[PDB]
Amino acid sequence: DVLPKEVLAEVGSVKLFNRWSYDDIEIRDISLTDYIQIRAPVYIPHSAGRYAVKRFRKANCPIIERLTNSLMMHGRNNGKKLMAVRIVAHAFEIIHLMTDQNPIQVAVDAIVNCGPREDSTRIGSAGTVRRQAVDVSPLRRVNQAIALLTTGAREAAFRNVKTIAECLAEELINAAKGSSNSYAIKKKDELERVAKSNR
């Protein structure tokens, strides 16, 4: 009886974060594989990895830690991912209870849709824009998506009686399809539109 009696069913099953097995992940598109890593799972994102030491060592990392790190910002939330890991796991339950689908399915398909493909870079034109509408790499896609996603949740929940958990929850489910009521997708769509102009 060294281990808690209640949490015993998992042992006869493949490794998972109790409530959700990572098995049977989406089949929707390509070009973001090799850059989202789930093939080696983890229970909790609180792993003290040395991803920063090299260029692409942070490319081999479960997406679950990425979300937790991105959520903590703005001075007060510096190094306190415990709340962050709390919210993400709890928010998973909300969307699972609000929709029969797997919450990892909710997070993955949203982030693969909310990334731009072309953008614009400010080369010197003596005060004007020679903006050639350059392309974007798949790695930067997820980097900007996660960053802008988490910012959308906090700004919405700010100065409101709603809390971030369900606010973040609503953000993911609206981004599943073209709801247009999501911070991410609204700003995402304009980016190509201004880029398409200077094409």
Pick the stretch among 10-18, 77-85, 93-101, 108-116 that binds RNA (CB under 7 A): 77-85
Q: How far is the CB of 100 from RNA (least distance, A)?
A: 26
* Contact of residue 176 among RNA, other proteins, none (CB under 5-8 Å per partner type): none
Report if residue 188 touches RNA, rule: CB under 7 A.
no
User: 67, 88 in Cβ contact below 8 A?
Assistant: yes
Among 110, 164, 172, 195, binds RNA (CB under 7 A): 164
Q: How far is the CB of 123 from other proteins (least distance, A)?
A: 35
SS3 183: helix
Beta strands (DSSP E) in the chain are 118-119, 134-135
Report if residue 173 touches other proteins, rule: CB under 8 A.
no
Among 140, 177, 186, 196, binds RNA (CB under 7 A): 140
| Footprint on residues 88-127 left by other proteins (CB under 8 A) | 90, 93-94, 97-98
Beta carbons within 8 Å of 126's beta carbon, 6+ residues apart: none
Sign of CA dihedral 95, 103, 115, 47: positive
CB-side neighbour CA atoms (13 Å) of 154: 14
User: Considering only CA atoms, which of 39, 42, 33, 99 is closest in space to residue 67?
Assistant: 42
Lookup: tokens for 130: 């020679």
Distance CA 34, CA 36 (A): 6
Distance CA 115, CA 142 (A): 7
Pick the stretch among 54-62, 108-116, 136-144, 159-167 that binds other proteins (CB under 8 A): 159-167
Report if residue 40 touches other proteins, rule: CB under 8 A.
no
Q: How far is the CB of 162 from other proteins (least distance, A)?
A: 5
Q: How far is the CB of 82 from RNA (least distance, A)?
A: 4
Pick the stretch among 68-76, 125-133, 162-170, 190-198 that binds other proteins (CB under 8 A): 162-170
